[PDB]
């Protein structure tokens, strides 16, 4: 109920969709002065400022990143590495964090909702949704996250389908 409204209020201005002949196939992320955007989602950036840049690539970590200018670094997402197990907020409701794995209940999940960040009860991004795999009743996510040392860890289960 109110969780989706809080997601729409937090991700209103900072989330920009990716257009491809009128089709919405992905979402970029503006956090820490960096613009995260995946490889398989191909299209034009809806924002005029973020589209006229050059994104350095990382095909192993499946991420394109760029440098957000200084006049927009205050209006970004927050990020942290301290995260316990339990529940977190996602755009379609809740997501479970168990044994270092993000799980989403079934019914939701198609092609197009790639790049949506995972939020917490305070308002900090803990993961970035990149893919998903159907596991019985409860699907698992293939995402990226950080740690205490500062190494971007990409978690990928078996036989995932890119969204």
């Amino acid at each position: 109920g109110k969780r989706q409204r809080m997601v729409m209020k937090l991700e209103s201005d900072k989330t920009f969709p990716i257009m491809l002949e009128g089709k919405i196939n992905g979402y970029a992320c503006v956090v820490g002065g960096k613009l995260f955007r995946p490889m398989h989602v191909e299209g034009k950036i809806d924002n005029d400022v973020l589209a006229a840049l050059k994104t350095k690539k990382a095909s192993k970590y499946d991420l394109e990143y760029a440098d957000v200018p200084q006049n927009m670094r205050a209006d970004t997402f927050k990020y942290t590495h301290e995260k316990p197990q339990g529940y977190y907020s996602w755009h379609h409701g809740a997501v479970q964090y168990e044994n270092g794995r993000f799980t989403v209940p079934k019914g939701v999940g198609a092609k197009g909702d790639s790049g949506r960040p995972i939020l917490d009860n305070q308002g900090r991004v803990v993961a970035i949704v990149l893919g998903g795999v159907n596991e019985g009743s409860r699907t698992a996510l293939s995402v990226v996250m950080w740690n205490e040392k500062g190494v971007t860890v990409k978690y990928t289960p078996e036989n995932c389908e890119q969204w």
Partner: protein, 48 residues
């Protein structure tokens, strides 16, 4: 001719593996939004 070809292939392949390992070092540290490099992996990989 064959010694120059062997030396050329070896130097090119070693430089290729060096660039591959430098990318493999610096790829996890650049995707982080903090954008910091630790002390050992900065100078040893010319990260700045």
């Amino acid at each position: 001719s064959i010694c120059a070809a062997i030396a050329t292939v070896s130097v090119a392949a070693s430089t290729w593996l060096f660039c591959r390992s430098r990318v493999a070092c610096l790829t996890p540290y650049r995707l982080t939004p903090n954008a910091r490099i630790p002390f050992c992996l900065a100078v040893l990989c010319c990260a700045r």
